Design a protein around this ligand. Sequence first.
Ligand SMILES: Nc1nc2c(ncn2[C@@H]2O[C@H](COP(=O)(O)OP(=O)(O)O)[C@@H](O)[C@H]2O)c(=O)[nH]1
Ligand SMILES: Nc1nc2c(ncn2[C@@H]2O[C@H](COP(=O)(O)OP(=O)(O)O)[C@@H](O)[C@H]2O)c(=O)[nH]1
Lengths: 369, 370, 302, 308
Amino acid sequence: REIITLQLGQCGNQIGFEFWKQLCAEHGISPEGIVEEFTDRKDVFFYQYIPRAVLLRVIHSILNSPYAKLYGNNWASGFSQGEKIHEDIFDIIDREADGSDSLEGFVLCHSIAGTGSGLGSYLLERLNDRYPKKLVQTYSVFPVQPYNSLLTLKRLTQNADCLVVLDNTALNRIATDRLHIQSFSQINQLVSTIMSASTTTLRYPGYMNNDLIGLIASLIPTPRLHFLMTGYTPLTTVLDVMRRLLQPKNVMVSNHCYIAILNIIQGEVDPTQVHKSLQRIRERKLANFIPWGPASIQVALSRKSPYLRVSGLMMANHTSISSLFERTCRQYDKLRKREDNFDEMDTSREIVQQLIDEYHAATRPDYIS
Amino acid sequence: REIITLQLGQCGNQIGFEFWKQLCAEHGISPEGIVEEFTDRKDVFFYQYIPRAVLLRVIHSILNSPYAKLYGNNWASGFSQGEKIHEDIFDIIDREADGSDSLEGFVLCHSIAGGTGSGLGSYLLERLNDRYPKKLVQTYSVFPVQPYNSLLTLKRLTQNADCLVVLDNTALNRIATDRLHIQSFSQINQLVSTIMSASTTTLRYPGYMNNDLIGLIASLIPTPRLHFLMTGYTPLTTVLDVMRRLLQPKNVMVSNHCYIAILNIIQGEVDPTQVHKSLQRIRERKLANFIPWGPASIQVALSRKSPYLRVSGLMMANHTSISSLFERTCRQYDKLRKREDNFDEMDTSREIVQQLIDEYHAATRPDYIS
Amino acid sequence: LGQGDFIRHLMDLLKPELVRPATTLYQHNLTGILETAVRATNAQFDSPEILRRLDVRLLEDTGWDVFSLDYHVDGPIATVFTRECMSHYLRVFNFLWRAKRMEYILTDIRKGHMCNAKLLRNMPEFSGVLHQCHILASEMVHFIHQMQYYITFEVLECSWDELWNKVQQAQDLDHIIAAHEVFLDTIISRCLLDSDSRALLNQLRAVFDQIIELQNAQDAIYRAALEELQRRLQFEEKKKEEEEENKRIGEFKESIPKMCSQLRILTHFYQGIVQQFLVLLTTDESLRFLSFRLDFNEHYKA
Amino acid sequence: STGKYLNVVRECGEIIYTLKERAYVEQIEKAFNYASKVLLDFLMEEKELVAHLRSIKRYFLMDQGDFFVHFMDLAEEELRKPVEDITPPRLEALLELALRMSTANTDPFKDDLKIDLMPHDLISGLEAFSFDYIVKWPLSLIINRKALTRYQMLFRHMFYCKHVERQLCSVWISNKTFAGAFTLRQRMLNFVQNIQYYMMFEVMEPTWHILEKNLKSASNIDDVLGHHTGFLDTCLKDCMLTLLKVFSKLMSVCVMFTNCMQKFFEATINKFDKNFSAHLLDLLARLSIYSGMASVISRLDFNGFYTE
Ligand SMILES: Nc1nc2c(ncn2[C@@H]2O[C@H](COP(=O)(O)OP(=O)(O)O)[C@@H](O)[C@H]2O)c(=O)[nH]1
Ligand SMILES: Nc1nc2c(ncn2[C@@H]2O[C@H](COP(=O)(O)OP(=O)(O)O)[C@@H](O)[C@H]2O)c(=O)[nH]1
């Protein structure tokens, strides 16, 4: 099962270009697409080695970079032009699909803040037409700006089978708090750390989680509550790492309860004190979950690349993600009272309200019905 | 059995010259056509040493090359000029033919994209089908007013040439930009000559099987119509890795569907006991599909690399997807037919290529018979 | 037959001779042909000593049933072969000679069809029955062109490797005899020339026979179409009467469904002897690698 | 124990009597202490037993993930067929192709995996599949048919739990473009993926981690033969393999519920709920009544749910 990734807009290119650089080094692969001599499953993202990427003036910046041998501002402009090249970019994706053994997903990296917004809205619609059995995960990045942002949310709530939020605001704080930057060339270094460590269980096979649909169906219980946030502590036992992930200082997000937690421990920690910490987290009650359904916390170990110390990443499905929407929803109405049908915006307006209500209904002891 | 090759047009002449350079380098033959001191059966392509070539401006470039000691743009113009000098070129062809002990075939290397080479090769194919009825004709044709010439060449190639190997410049340029980082003719021609030299490997280094051209042809081509093949060259280590990298669409030189016949040539010093395990695991994992009507299998053969010159491999496939390419040309012809003595030959060409595309599309059905 | 280059030329020169019955065949004539092949192919660049022993012998029908090479060896080297390795090689050489003429027949037919359709491509009423002549060929050449690979890779290249490995390390000339004696007990076993695998080889011979019957029922259907084509050429070139030929052309179309019932019953019996052949392989272990070669993509076994 | 070590190495590649003085008793030890040091080192550097047990663990305990997600994906249609209907020449051809295409290609001992269709189930077609491992003579003293079927008893119990939540997670995409079954799928998925985690990282792993260290301080073969069967009787005890047949019937409603959803009623989804939830509560009732076998409850429920 192979995962063909997409990169749209200046954001998607920059994070993806730095995502591949983090992966190319984590394996024994020279930037010349040649394996270095110097066990790790590398067929998912690489084709025997060439990465399975379909990019879409930053492109020239990549073609001049040493990695050259490895391959307007309106939302309407993005959706319009995307229709004019419907056959062009689908020729590439189709020829890249059948050449692969068995396609599994479409990890799409785009920012909802110019053309990446309108084009990505076009793709996520068109993929569900032709490919109805392919998961579509998206590493969307949060920042007329209120308009282009929410319009993509209309598509991301009914097409994308998963979504990982990464807002630049909360990232900028961690850029200022523990890195003291005051720049895009620095915050993306943290984004590339989150994207690479997200698929560490696919590239390093273990007991479980050897396929993308194994990481998805565990967290997302229902087709609607499909938004996830991340947590990465290293910026020492398993109890030291588990306690730091639950602190609000580490989450990349600016009653409320969790739905499902998955912990990624990339250390060499002995697998015997893994149940003791989980036992302790239950006692001190450092996190609460949904009251209606049985919600449990899962922890997964892996092995660090010898070619490159305990780290940790947490995939979270938290109801407090509804706050980020309200900030978009709020500023929209203000721009709606300040200035061929203008119905798509209002129709998108309604469905976002259905989503936020579903979150605030998820924290109720009677979320069923 | 001796194979005589012909080179027409600029593209054909250049690729043939580079192929001869590669083959002379593979053996111990100096550019001065003198054997160097420094097992390899070389009688097929060389005459005791002189190559069996018939070249037909770039000839001056070859004559200025260190290898001098080794020897309009319309289709109708090419056909007319080829008709004008029938006897002149055919005297050369006949003397080189009857001079040989036992002729076997006529390798033709030319570009059907356009110019005079297209029509000249058309005329030569017709006249060779006329005169010699017992000689196989293989063609290393290269794919790109262009649609007109291309479709006419396809019309003449779908009934005369007993085999054919396609080479699209688009896929070659794609591979060059991907894994060679060129941005040129003199660079893609390197890969072209590599594929060509590796194509006739089993004829020069004798093995258990495949000692003659019929051994290569009759295995793949099941019916006289489905005679278009595609190539794949993975090394740009076990045989399983080679076979898994070969069947990837990333390497095939091509821009439901299934396979008709597959042939693998392995030139390495690998252990020949793991090949059956490789085929077993390939069948297990189900990486490729076959025709549903007839029993079609994949054949694999080994050889030896030139010691005077590591594990490599090449793959020759009979895939029904190739028809797609023709469609494009066909499509363009229609677009050219509605935008602008009898002009009926082009219509007959369109008719027969439509027949061929329909036959390809029907080949992938469980009741292809009848 | 490990040379390939030499045996190819040798099968082209013995073709006009062996077609005659054995009574008109005398050994003193064939030697000049064998000597000619060794001079033409790459076998000329070879040690003169080993070429002094390579000769012919006539087994005691047709010329394709009594021809075989001998390579007699006498002297000190004769204590390694001991008159039994020379009685096993000829027991093997027959199986490699048959499986070599059953292939050069099927590349001659496949050569005829490439020059066949280049002539009679103007008779759209004949391609309906000519098609069954192609499919039966491409279904028959697979069974043979696949068995050739099992002979090369799983019998020769594999069982010889276990011999050259137990020779460059053996010594005292008694680990060489025992390594060369078992090298002739696996080839007899991996090929179907065993004693208890008799039911398998006689089953294979029937498939070897069906290849010949096709080559006899093909040229009959092939030539019968060239005569009617040649008459149709002269019946119009000299004049450019009309009613006396339409009955000849009309009856010629009526004989076509008769020939179609031949290739429809020849094929339906060829598949009945192969689908029976596979069942006999499930009997003694290396034969399993043959069942996969034939049954690739499961063209049989439904 | 001295000469026997000398023979399993040879075939592959002065003492006087005194009374009241033990000039020979010490002499035997100075040779036995070398008789072992040549054999033990022979197994760690060249043909690297400990480097032989790890290979068995990859397939029998399903440690290697890339090999199973690619094998069941290829050999599923050919396993749902009933027993005495599938040709072993068809499975083994897929097993060989499953290993090489995966990342298990870097395994010297991979060529000892054989298919073995058991006649009885875990007291057909899918419930009658299990690997078999053939070993040579000198190692057959440790891992033998008596102590290999145990590896084959705790394998099927893990190939079943890996199969259900492989297809239960497969229906997850079919429904995603009548709406009350999503909260029931949550009740079974959070049960198998809460048993598998306890079964892989807190049961066999801990025991395996001990065995590896417990074989560095070995002194004689009849001790290694104790640290091994002392590891298999613990895995079969900490797991539910030793009775607790309520798990067997509990799995039936999970796999069958996948069939109902695969037929695309509203009175049948709620029928599975009252049937599965009742079966689950029978488990935690018996898992709690004992003298780990108690920490499993903390893995099943984490939110205080199922407090009835
Ligand atoms: N996190 C992050 N976000 C970025 C980066 N570069 C651009 N962005 C986001 O992308 C948005 C601008 O998108 P833009 O480049 O105009 O899209 P385009 O019109 O398709 O080129 C801004 O709102 C940023 O938030 C980066 O390096 N890191
Ligand atoms: N692949 C490849 N194609 C070539 C090369 N040189 C020329 N061609 C093709 O040949 C065509 C031009 O043919 P041309 O020389 O005009 O034919 P002429 O008019 O008979 O001389 C172009 O469309 C090219 O695609 C080469 O080096 N490599």
